[PDB]
């Protein structure tokens, strides 16, 4: 109820000033359910990739953080195969004042500069630390398979 | 278009009872209260710790809102 | 531009505020002015004459911002 | 120096929205001295009266209350024959946020509803509580003797 107006007002503002490399909107008419599309940062082995992300809003939103999941596959130390994202905004540093926009920007930041020390996929984390060139290469190839087409 | 100062960082609507936290930031009383009740002791907009968890009304902003509403034929919040 | 909104003026100095702060009663004053009153050993709100339920002077940022937008948009500087 | 600024700006405010039954302003160019005129309130036994009042500003105005006295003779249980006004705002309950305007208004509320409970002339308070008709009449006579004209 309170959550419903807040999401409605958050969507309006998001479509006024959209985030830098990103697009988001309701899934049809369930405006408690949002799809966002993120372009791979250019500094990244993800450039030229289109990544789809799913957004569901908890009952006590904006006091509980939103549920944010990749739909596109990514070779990343902090995104697993189920599309779960290890991001502090999304778990513990959430605030009632942050927004979907902020979360999308933070996800782009992760894609540019992964955080291997808080791994969700330890093999990928290990590869990033010990063989970075293999990480960068394998990411280009995953981006090419599942994002660019 | 509502001036952004007159809106709550949490609710994003025009504020009815604007109150100020020790950080110096202003919020709608019910929202900021709810968050403190949840047990958090941080200013949500600046994410820094709060010295004290006390809500002081922001009567000057209340006045400036009530006036803008009367000016722009809007219902008082 | 030539009529300063009463809300931007300090109840004590009757002057446009540079550093608005707020006391526990919810009233807002220029920092220097409310300080001189507290330093004189009065622990009461000048405007509501109710006794102040603490002494911390928290900044009224939203008010300071509005004063800046009004100043810039009319041409006034804020000494 | 701050006191002078605060006085000149309080003077401009009075000129824009002057107090209700009252006119006030500086004596010449000496800016720390004001004379002021009060019209006796309608309900009161001072109606049709014109009363004069001196206002002397401290050096630490507004943090120190101003000196304010009747220069016109009145029959009041809280005003004395030397003009001294017994009103809490001028002594104990002064505030850096009160103005000459608010003081004049209080002096008006005083003439209309006097405080027997704290006299400065106990004779008149005794009359106000013993024989009100003796008071109203004595007042109206002093009004016409000294204030009408």
UniProtKB/Swiss-Prot annotation, chain C:
Gene field: PUB12
Sequence ranges assigned to domain U-box in this UniProt record: 3-77
Parent sequence residues shown: 227 to 303 of 611
Superkingdom: Eukaryota
Annotated protein name in UniProt: U-box domain-containing protein 12
UniProt organism field: Oryza sativa subsp. japonica
Summary of the function given for this chain in its UniProt record: Possesses E3 ubiquitin-protein ligase in vitro.
């Amino acid at each position: 109820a309170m959550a419903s107006k807040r999401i409605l007002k958050e969507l309006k503002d998001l479509q006024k000033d959209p985030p830098t490399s990103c697009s988001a909107g309701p899934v049809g008419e369930d405006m408690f359910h949002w799809q966002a599309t993120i372009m791979g940062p250019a500094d990244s082995p993800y450039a030229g990739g289109v990544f789809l992300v799913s957004i569901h809003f908890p009952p006590d939103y904006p006091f509980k953080p939103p549920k944010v999941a990749f739909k596109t596959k990514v070779f990343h130390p902090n995104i697993n195969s189920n599309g779960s994202i290890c991001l502090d905004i999304l778990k513990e540093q959430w605030s009632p004042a942050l927004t979907v926009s902020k979360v999308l920007l933070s996800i782009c930041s992760l894609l540019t500069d992964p955080n291997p020390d808080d791994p969700l996929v330890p093999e990928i984390a290990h590869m990033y630390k010990t063989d970075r060139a293999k990480y960068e290469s394998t990411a280009r190839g995953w981006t090419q398979k599942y994002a660019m087409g | 278009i509502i001036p952004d100062e007159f809106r709550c960082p949490i609710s994003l609507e025009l504020m009815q009872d604007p109150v100020i936290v020790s950080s110096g930031q202003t919020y709608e009383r019910s929202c900021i209260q709810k968050w403190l009740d949840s047990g958090h002791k941080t200013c949500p907009k600046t994410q820094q710790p709060l010295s004290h968890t006390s809500l002081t009304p922001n009567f000057v902003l209340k006045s400036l809102i009530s006036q803008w509403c009367e000016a722009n034929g809007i219902e008082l919040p």
